[PDB]
Short mmCIF file of C-alpha atoms and ligand atoms in Angstrom, two decimals:
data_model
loop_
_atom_site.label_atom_id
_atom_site.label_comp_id
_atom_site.label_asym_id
_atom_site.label_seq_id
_atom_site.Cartn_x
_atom_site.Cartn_y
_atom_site.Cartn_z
CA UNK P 3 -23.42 -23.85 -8.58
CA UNK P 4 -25.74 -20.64 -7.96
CA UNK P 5 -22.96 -18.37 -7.11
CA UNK P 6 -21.27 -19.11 -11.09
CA UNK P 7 -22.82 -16.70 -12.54
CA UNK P 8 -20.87 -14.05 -10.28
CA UNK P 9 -17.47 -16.12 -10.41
CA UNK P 10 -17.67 -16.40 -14.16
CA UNK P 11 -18.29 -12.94 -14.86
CA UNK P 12 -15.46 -11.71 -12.70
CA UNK P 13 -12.74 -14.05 -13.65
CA UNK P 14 -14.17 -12.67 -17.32
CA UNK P 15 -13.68 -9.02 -16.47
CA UNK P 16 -10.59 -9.52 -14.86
CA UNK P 17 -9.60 -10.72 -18.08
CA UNK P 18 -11.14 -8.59 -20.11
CA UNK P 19 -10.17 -5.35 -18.26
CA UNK P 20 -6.59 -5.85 -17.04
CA UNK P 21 -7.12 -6.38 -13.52
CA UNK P 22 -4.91 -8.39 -11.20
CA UNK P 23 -6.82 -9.14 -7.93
CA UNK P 24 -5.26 -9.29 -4.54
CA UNK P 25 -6.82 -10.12 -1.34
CA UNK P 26 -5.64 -10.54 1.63
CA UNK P 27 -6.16 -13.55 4.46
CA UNK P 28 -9.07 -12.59 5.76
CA UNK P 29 -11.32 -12.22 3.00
CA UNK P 30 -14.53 -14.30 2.15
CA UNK P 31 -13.56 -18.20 1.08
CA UNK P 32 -15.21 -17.23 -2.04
CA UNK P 33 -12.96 -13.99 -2.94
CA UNK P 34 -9.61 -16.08 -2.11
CA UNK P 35 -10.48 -18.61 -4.61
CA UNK P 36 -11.10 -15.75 -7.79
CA UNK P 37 -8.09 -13.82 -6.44
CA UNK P 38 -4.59 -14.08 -8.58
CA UNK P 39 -2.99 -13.71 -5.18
CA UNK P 40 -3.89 -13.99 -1.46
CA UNK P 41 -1.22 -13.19 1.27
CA UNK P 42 -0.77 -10.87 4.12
CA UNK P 43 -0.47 -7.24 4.00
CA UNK P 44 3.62 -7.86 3.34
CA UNK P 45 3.09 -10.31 0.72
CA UNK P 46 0.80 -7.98 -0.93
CA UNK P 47 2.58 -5.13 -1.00
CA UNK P 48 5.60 -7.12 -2.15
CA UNK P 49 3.26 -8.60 -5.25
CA UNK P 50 2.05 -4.82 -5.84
CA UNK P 51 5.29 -3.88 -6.80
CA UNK P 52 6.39 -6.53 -8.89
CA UNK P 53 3.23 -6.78 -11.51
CA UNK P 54 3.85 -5.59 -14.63
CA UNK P 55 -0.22 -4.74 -14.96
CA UNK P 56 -1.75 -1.16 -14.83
CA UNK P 57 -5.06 -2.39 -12.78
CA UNK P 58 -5.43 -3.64 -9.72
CA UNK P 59 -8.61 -4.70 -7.82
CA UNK P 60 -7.74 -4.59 -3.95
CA UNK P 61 -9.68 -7.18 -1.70
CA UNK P 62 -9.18 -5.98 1.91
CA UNK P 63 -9.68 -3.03 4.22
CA UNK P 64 -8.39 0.51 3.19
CA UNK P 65 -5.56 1.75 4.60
CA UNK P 66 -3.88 -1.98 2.53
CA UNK P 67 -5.43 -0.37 -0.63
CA UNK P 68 -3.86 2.60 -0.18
CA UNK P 69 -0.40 1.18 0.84
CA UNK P 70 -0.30 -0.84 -2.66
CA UNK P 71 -1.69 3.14 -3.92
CA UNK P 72 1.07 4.87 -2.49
CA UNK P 73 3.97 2.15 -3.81
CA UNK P 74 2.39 2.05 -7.34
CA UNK P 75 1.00 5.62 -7.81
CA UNK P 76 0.57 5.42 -11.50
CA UNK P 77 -1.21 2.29 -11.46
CA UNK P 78 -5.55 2.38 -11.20
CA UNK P 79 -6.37 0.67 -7.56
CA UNK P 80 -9.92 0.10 -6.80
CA UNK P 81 -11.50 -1.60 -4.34
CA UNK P 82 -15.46 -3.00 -4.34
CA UNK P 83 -16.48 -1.39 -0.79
CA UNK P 84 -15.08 1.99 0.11
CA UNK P 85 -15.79 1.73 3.73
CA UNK P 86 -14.23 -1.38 4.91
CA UNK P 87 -11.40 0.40 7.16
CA UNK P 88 -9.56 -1.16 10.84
CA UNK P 89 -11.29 1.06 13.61
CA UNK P 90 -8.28 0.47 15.40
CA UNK P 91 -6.41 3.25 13.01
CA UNK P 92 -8.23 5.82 13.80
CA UNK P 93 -7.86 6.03 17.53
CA UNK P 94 -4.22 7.32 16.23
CA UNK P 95 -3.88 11.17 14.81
CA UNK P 96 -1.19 13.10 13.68
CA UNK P 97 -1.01 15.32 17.42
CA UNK P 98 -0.84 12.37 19.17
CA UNK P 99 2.20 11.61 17.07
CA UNK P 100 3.44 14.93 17.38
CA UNK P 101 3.45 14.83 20.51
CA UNK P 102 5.15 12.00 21.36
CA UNK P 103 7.80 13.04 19.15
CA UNK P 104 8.42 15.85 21.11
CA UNK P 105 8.36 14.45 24.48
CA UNK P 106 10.80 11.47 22.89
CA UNK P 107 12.87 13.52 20.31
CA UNK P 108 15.23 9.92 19.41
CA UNK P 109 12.57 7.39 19.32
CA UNK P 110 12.15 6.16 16.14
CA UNK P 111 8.06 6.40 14.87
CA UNK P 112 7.40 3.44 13.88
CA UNK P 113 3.88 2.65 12.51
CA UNK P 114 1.71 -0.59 12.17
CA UNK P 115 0.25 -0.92 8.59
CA UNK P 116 -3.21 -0.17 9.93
CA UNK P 117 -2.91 3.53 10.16
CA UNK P 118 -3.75 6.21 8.34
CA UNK P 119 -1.91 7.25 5.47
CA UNK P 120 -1.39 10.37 6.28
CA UNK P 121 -0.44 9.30 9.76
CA UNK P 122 1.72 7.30 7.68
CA UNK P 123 3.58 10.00 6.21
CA UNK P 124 4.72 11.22 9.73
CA UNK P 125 6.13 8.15 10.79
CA UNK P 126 9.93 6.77 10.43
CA UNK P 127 9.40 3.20 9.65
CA UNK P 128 6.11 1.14 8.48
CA UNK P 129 5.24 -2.39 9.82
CA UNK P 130 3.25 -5.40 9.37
CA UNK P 131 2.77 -8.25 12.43
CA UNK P 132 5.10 -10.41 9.61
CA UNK P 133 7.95 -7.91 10.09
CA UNK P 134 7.62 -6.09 12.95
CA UNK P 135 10.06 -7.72 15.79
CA UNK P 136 13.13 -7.84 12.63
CA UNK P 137 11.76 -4.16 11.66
CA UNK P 138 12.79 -2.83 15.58
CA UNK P 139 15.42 -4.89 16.32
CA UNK P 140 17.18 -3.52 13.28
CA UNK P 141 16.70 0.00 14.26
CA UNK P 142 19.71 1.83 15.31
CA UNK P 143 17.49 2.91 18.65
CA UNK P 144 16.75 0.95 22.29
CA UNK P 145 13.68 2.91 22.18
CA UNK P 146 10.18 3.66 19.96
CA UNK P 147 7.07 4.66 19.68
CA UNK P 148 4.87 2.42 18.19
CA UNK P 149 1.41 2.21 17.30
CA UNK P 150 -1.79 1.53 16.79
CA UNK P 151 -1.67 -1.60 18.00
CA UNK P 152 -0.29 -2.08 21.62
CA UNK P 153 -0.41 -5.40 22.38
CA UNK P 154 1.29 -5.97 19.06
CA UNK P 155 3.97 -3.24 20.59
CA UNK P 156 4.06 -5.18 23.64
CA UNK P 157 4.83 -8.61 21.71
CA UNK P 158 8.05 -6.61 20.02
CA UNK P 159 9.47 -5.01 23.17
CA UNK P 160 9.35 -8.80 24.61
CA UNK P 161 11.04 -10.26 21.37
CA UNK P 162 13.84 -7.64 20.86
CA UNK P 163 14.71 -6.36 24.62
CA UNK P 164 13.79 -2.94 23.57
CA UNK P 165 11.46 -0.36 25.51
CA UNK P 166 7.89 0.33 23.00
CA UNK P 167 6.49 3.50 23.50
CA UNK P 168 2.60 2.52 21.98
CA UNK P 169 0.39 5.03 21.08
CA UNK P 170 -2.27 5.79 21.30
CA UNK P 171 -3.89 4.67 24.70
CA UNK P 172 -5.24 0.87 24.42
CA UNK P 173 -5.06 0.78 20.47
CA UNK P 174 -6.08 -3.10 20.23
CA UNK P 175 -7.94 -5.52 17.81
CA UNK P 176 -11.30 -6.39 18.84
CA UNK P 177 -11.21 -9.88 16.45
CA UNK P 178 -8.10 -11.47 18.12
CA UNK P 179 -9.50 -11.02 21.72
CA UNK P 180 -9.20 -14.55 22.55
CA UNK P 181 -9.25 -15.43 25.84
CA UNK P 182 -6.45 -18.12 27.38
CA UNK P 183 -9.45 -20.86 28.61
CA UNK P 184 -9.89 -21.57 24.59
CA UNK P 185 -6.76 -22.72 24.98
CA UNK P 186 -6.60 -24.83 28.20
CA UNK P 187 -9.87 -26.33 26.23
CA UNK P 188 -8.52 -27.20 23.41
CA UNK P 189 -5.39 -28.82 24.86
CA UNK P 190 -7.38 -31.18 26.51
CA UNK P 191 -9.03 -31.96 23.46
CA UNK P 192 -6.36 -32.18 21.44
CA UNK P 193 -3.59 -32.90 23.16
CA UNK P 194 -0.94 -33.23 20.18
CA UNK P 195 -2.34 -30.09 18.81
CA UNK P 196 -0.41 -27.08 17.77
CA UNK P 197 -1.36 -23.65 18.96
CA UNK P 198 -0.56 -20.73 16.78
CA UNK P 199 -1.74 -17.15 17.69
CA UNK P 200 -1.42 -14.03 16.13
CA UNK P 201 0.78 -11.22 18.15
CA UNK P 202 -2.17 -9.09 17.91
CA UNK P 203 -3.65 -11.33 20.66
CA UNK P 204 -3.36 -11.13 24.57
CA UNK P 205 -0.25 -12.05 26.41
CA UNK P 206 -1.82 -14.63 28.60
CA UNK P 207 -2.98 -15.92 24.94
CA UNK P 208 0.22 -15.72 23.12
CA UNK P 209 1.84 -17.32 26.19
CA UNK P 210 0.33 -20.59 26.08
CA UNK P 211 0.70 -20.89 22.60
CA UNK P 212 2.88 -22.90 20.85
CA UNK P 213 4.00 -20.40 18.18
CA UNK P 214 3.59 -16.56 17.68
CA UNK P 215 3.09 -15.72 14.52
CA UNK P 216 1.38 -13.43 11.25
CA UNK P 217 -0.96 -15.13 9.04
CA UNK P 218 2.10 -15.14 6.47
CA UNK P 219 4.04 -16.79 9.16
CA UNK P 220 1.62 -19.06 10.28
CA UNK P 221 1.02 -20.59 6.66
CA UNK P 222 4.97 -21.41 6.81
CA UNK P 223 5.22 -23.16 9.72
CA UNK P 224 3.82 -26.74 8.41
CA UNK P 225 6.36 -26.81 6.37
CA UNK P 226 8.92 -27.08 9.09
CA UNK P 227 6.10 -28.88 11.94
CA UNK P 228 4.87 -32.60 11.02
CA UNK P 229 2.27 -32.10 13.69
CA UNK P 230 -1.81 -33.17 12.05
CA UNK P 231 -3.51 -30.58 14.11
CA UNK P 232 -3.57 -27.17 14.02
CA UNK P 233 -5.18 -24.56 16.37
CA UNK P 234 -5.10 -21.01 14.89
CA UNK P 235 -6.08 -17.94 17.11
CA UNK P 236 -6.57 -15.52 14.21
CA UNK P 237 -9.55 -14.09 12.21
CA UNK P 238 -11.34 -16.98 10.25
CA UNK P 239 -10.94 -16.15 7.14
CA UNK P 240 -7.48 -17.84 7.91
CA UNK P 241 -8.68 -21.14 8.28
CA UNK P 242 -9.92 -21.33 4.65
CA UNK P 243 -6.47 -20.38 3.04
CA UNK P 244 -4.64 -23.15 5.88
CA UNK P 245 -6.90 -25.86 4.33
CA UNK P 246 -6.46 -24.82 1.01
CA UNK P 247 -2.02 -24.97 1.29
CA UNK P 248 -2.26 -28.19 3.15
CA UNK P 249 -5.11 -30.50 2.89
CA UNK P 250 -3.70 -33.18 4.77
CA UNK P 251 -3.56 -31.27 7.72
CA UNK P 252 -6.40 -30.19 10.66
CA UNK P 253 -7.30 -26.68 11.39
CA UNK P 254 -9.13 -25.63 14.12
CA UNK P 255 -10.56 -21.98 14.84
CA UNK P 256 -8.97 -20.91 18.72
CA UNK P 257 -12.74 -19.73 18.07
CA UNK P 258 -15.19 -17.86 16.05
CA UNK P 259 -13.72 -14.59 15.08
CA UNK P 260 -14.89 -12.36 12.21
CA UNK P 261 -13.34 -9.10 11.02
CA UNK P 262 -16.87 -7.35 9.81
CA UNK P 263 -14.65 -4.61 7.68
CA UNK P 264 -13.11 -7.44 6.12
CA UNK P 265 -16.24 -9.05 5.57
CA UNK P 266 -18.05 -5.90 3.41
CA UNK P 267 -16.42 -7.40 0.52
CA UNK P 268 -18.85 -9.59 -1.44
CA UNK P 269 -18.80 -11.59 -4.69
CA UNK P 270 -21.80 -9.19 -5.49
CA UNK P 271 -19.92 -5.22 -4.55
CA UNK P 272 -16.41 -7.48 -6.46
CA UNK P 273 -18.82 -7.79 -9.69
CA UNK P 274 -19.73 -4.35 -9.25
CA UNK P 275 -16.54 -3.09 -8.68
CA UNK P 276 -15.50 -4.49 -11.97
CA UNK P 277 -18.01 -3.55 -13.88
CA UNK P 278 -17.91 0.20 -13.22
CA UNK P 279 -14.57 0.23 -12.11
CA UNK P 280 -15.11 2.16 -9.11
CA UNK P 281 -13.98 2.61 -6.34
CA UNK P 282 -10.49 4.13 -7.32
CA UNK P 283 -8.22 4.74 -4.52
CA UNK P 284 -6.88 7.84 -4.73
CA UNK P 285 -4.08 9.72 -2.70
CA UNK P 286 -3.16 13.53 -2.44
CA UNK P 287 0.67 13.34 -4.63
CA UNK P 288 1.93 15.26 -1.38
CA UNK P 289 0.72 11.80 0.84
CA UNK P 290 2.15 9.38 -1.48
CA UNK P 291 5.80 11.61 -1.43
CA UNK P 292 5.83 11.97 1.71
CA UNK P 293 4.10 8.16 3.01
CA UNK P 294 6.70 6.15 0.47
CA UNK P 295 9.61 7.11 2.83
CA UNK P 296 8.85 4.87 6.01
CA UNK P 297 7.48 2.30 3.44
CA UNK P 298 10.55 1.98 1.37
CA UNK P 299 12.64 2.06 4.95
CA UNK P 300 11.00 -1.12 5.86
CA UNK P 301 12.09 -2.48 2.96
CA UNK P 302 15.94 -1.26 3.93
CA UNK P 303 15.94 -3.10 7.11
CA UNK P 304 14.80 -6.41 6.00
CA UNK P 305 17.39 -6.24 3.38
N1 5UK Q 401 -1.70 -7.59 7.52
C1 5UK Q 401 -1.41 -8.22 8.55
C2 5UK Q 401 -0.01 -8.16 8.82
O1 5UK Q 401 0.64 -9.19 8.96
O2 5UK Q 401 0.52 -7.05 8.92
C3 5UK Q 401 -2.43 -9.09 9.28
C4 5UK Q 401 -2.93 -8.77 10.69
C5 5UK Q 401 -3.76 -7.51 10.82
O3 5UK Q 401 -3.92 -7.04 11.92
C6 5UK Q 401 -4.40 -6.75 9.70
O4 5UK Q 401 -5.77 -7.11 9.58
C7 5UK Q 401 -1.79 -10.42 9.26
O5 5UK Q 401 -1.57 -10.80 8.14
O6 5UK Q 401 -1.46 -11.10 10.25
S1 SF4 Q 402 -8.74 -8.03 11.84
FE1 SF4 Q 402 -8.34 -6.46 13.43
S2 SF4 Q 402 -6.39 -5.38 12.86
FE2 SF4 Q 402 -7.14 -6.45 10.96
S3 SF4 Q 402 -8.50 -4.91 9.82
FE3 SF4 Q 402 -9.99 -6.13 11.24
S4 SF4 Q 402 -10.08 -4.89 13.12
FE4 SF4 Q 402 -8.20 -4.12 11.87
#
């Protein structure tokens, strides 16, 4: 296999150097299978606090990096490509959440994991897709502001009855712009199929679909549904971790859809990464003070 040479020498360094490596769902096939873990952004920041090493090598986009920074400050994070970011963040600025604060003094901020972190350390409670609907309805508050992500913010007011203030003006994700015909298609195709989405899609997408759900959600539900055939409306890198927990079942792409920031990671920038390692995340001590409080709330209301 041409690519051992890079798989050999990374699961050596790893080894070698202390590092645990996390990715999340979206990454490369060929990352997820050198990674000691692969999850969602929950699952990941769950595992981050829980390892008893020092090192971590962070397979994802930045603002995820920085969230496993910012609940394990005295442990080294790096990750291989400094630039992979979600450009739907940073639509979203600390005067747009000031100001929304002011015009609705006792609605609760609560931010979507893609966001800055230092938009993260004026907000009231953090989210992930995985957590957000039990995150709100638990709130002591009929009303919030949410954001980035608005059709996300949309899904939650549906699910818990509450009113979702999102901010800031059409803060969406340009991979899970699916459009509903993929799904008329495919039922006719596959008429026993499943459909799972991702809340982060459409609501004439997520309303023909069988289930709503997070990556981390998604992966549970064949354990509870017998059915052969999957169809998953989420970012592809998806498909490869489905077929990987249960090989006996089908998965089928909604369609193509590739997250390119998620993509700049490479076996090639992971080798490099651990053999200078570089690039350390690093936080201002004032952002990590201050960002830990909505983080470590989420944690309060899921129990
Ligand atoms: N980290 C996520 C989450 O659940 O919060 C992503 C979705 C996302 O928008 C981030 O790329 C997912 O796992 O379903
Ligand atoms: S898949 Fe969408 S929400 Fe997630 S990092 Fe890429 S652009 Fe951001």
């Amino acid at each position: 296999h041409h690519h051992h040479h890079m798989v050999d020498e990374i699961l050596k360094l790893k080894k070698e150097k202390g590092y645990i490596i996390l990715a999340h769902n979206y990454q490369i096939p060929e990352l997820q299978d050198i990674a000691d873990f692969v999850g969602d952004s929950l699952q990941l920041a769950r595992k981050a606090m829980e390892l008893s090493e020092k090192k971590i090598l962070f397979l994802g986009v930045d603002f995820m990096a920085e969230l496993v920074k910012i609940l394990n400050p005295d442990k080294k994070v790096i990750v291989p490509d400094r630039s992979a970011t979600c450009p739907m963040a940073n639509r979203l600025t600390p005067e747009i959440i000031r100001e929304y604060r002011e015009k609705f003094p006792d609605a609760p901020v609560v931010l979507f994991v893609n966001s800055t972190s230092e938009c993260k350390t004026l907000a009231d409670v953090i989210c992930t897709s995985a957590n957000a609907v039990e995150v709100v309805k638990k709130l002591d508050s009929s009303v919030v502001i949410f954001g980035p992500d608005r059709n996300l913010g949309e899904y939650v007011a549906e699910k818990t009855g509450k009113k979702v203030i999102t901010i800031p003006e059409n803060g969406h994700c340009p991979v899970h712009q699916f459009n509903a015909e993929s799904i008329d298609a495919v039922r006719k195709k596959y008429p026993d199929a499943k459909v799972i989405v991702h809340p982060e899609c459409p609501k004439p997408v997520r309303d023909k679909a069988d289930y709503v759900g997070s990556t981390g959600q998604m992966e549970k539900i064949p354990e509870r549904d017998p059915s052969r055939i999957f169809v998953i409306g989420t970012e592809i890198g998806m498909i490869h971790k489905l077929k990987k927990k249960f090989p006996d079942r089908e998965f089928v792409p909604l369609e193509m859809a590739v997250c390119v920031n998620m993509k700049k990671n490479t076996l090639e920038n992971t080798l490099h990464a651990l053999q200078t390692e570089s690039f350390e995340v690093i936080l201002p001590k004032e952002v990590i003070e201050k960002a830990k409080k909505p983080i470590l709330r989420m944690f309060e209301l899921m129990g």
